[PDB]
Design an enzyme around this catalytic site. Sequence first.
Site, PDB file in Angstrom:
ATOM      1  CE1 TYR A  49      -3.894  -2.022   0.013  1.00 58.33           C
ATOM      2  CE2 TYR A  49      -2.917  -3.141   1.889  1.00 58.33           C
ATOM      3  CZ  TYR A  49      -3.873  -3.074   0.898  1.00 58.33           C
ATOM      4  OH  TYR A  49      -4.822  -4.065   0.785  1.00 58.33           O
ATOM      5  CB  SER A  50       2.735   3.056   1.574  1.00 56.29           C
ATOM      6  OG  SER A  50       3.358   2.303   2.588  1.00 56.29           O
ATOM      7  CB  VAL A  52       8.342   2.550   4.069  1.00 52.68           C
ATOM      8  CG1 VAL A  52       8.722   3.032   5.453  1.00 52.68           C
ATOM      9  CG2 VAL A  52       6.949   1.932   4.063  1.00 52.68           C
ATOM     10  CG  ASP A 155      -1.423  -6.545   9.070  1.00 50.25           C
ATOM     11  OD1 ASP A 155      -1.276  -7.787   8.980  1.00 50.25           O
ATOM     12  OD2 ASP A 155      -0.764  -5.717   8.392  1.00 50.25           O
TER      13      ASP A 155
HETATM   14  O1  LIG Z   1      12.512  -1.927   7.141  1.00 42.59           O
HETATM   15  C1  LIG Z   1      13.745  -1.336   7.365  1.00 42.59           C
HETATM   16  C2  LIG Z   1      13.853  -0.744   8.865  1.00 42.59           C
HETATM   17  O2  LIG Z   1      13.203   0.498   9.023  1.00 42.59           O
HETATM   18  C3  LIG Z   1      12.126   0.244   9.964  1.00 42.59           C
HETATM   19  N1  LIG Z   1      10.945   0.462   9.497  1.00 42.59           N
HETATM   20  C4  LIG Z   1      10.434  -0.188   8.420  1.00 42.59           C
HETATM   21  N2  LIG Z   1       9.163   0.233   8.228  1.00 42.59           N
HETATM   22  C5  LIG Z   1       8.865   1.122   9.203  1.00 42.59           C
HETATM   23  C6  LIG Z   1       7.691   1.827   9.453  1.00 42.59           C
HETATM   24 BR1  LIG Z   1       6.213   1.541   8.267  1.00 42.59          BR
HETATM   25  C7  LIG Z   1       7.568   2.714  10.503  1.00 42.59           C
HETATM   26 BR2  LIG Z   1       5.931   3.751  10.830  1.00 42.59          BR
HETATM   27  C8  LIG Z   1       8.645   2.882  11.306  1.00 42.59           C
HETATM   28 BR3  LIG Z   1       8.468   4.164  12.749  1.00 42.59          BR
HETATM   29  C9  LIG Z   1       9.832   2.184  11.090  1.00 42.59           C
HETATM   30 BR4  LIG Z   1      11.285   2.499  12.322  1.00 42.59          BR
HETATM   31  C10 LIG Z   1       9.948   1.272  10.005  1.00 42.59           C
HETATM   32  C11 LIG Z   1      12.189  -1.370  10.255  1.00 42.59           C
HETATM   33  C12 LIG Z   1      13.526  -1.665   9.858  1.00 42.59           C
HETATM   34  O3  LIG Z   1      14.422  -1.602  10.990  1.00 42.59           O
END
Ligand SMILES: OC[C@H]1O[C@@H](n2cnc3c(Br)c(Br)c(Br)c(Br)c32)C[C@@H]1O
Length: 329
Positions: A49-50, A52, A155
């Site tokens: 859905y997005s 990041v 979820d």
């Molecule tokens: O996915 C790579 C890294 O960046 C972090 N991360 C991944 N999706 C995230 C999201 Br979606 C959020 Br909201 C946050 Br706050 C963090 Br921190 C997130 C988890 C991992 O340590």
Amino acid sequence: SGPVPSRARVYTDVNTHRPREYWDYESHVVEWGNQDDYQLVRKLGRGKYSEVFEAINITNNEKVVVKILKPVKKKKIKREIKILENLRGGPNIITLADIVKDPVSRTPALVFEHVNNTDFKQLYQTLTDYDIRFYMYEILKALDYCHSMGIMHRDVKPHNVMIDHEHRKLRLIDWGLAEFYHPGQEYNVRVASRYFKGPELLVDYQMYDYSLDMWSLGCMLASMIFRKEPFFHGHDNYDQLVRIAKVLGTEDLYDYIDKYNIELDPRFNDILGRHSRKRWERFVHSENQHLVSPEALDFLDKLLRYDHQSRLTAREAMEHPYFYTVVKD
Ligand SMILES: OC[C@H]1O[C@@H](n2cnc3c(Br)c(Br)c(Br)c(Br)c32)C[C@@H]1O
């Protein structure tokens, strides 16, 4: 005829007694921030859905996480925004810092507080018995909060629990599948992620509630204490139910569907078989025994019930002896 109805046994009528504005997310008017305040630093990934990103808020030079939404219904986006705003400041709930219009995607970008997370695959391999209890209690704080606020997450899974292991801080994230609970409402069963889907979803029972999240949590607990991630490792949604039935047994599965006057998909006729309920001790071995205790097994047993109505609520879960050894703040 047709399915027997169901209601949550707690927080049943929370939304009916809140102002309409609280739950009527379709009417929500989004308050947009300044898109120029956020500088994207690196892409972290792309989900269903997005996309990041790690970013910096140039008004305070603090790290934030930005989710730039793929195109989706305004009511779905309003639902996630309204839920995040409703829950903001609650125990272990990720903080929505801002909402801006991304000029490239032409969609909203949600801005969240950053958590210095340790990849759950790596982290779970290091958790001690004490850590598992501690972080489970922290997750329960977030779930009892959102449930008490009339909201089911839908979820719950390791990917949506961000943990700063250094500071012992936890946040429940990714509220895009969450919904408001209204007694008697039929919901989409295409929620949660396969390994964490409750039996209610897998048998297409739509009148479910907060208790769905408790099944998902039990799946997490089983993976942690038995050091087997994921615990119920299905190849598809049908095999997922079979895997569950190989542990909880088929007779109690039939009791569940019989209670709610539900039929299994006939495609189960050739794959389900007959299985006894197992004792949780069979999953204990020399490599996970240090994470297992009678309290852990009883707690797990009380989360992983076919019948959503029989599962511990988040508040009941926090009363369990398993958490007696956790130092209270
Ligand atoms: O996915 C790579 C890294 O960046 C972090 N991360 C991944 N999706 C995230 C999201 Br979606 C959020 Br909201 C946050 Br706050 C963090 Br921190 C997130 C988890 C991992 O340590």
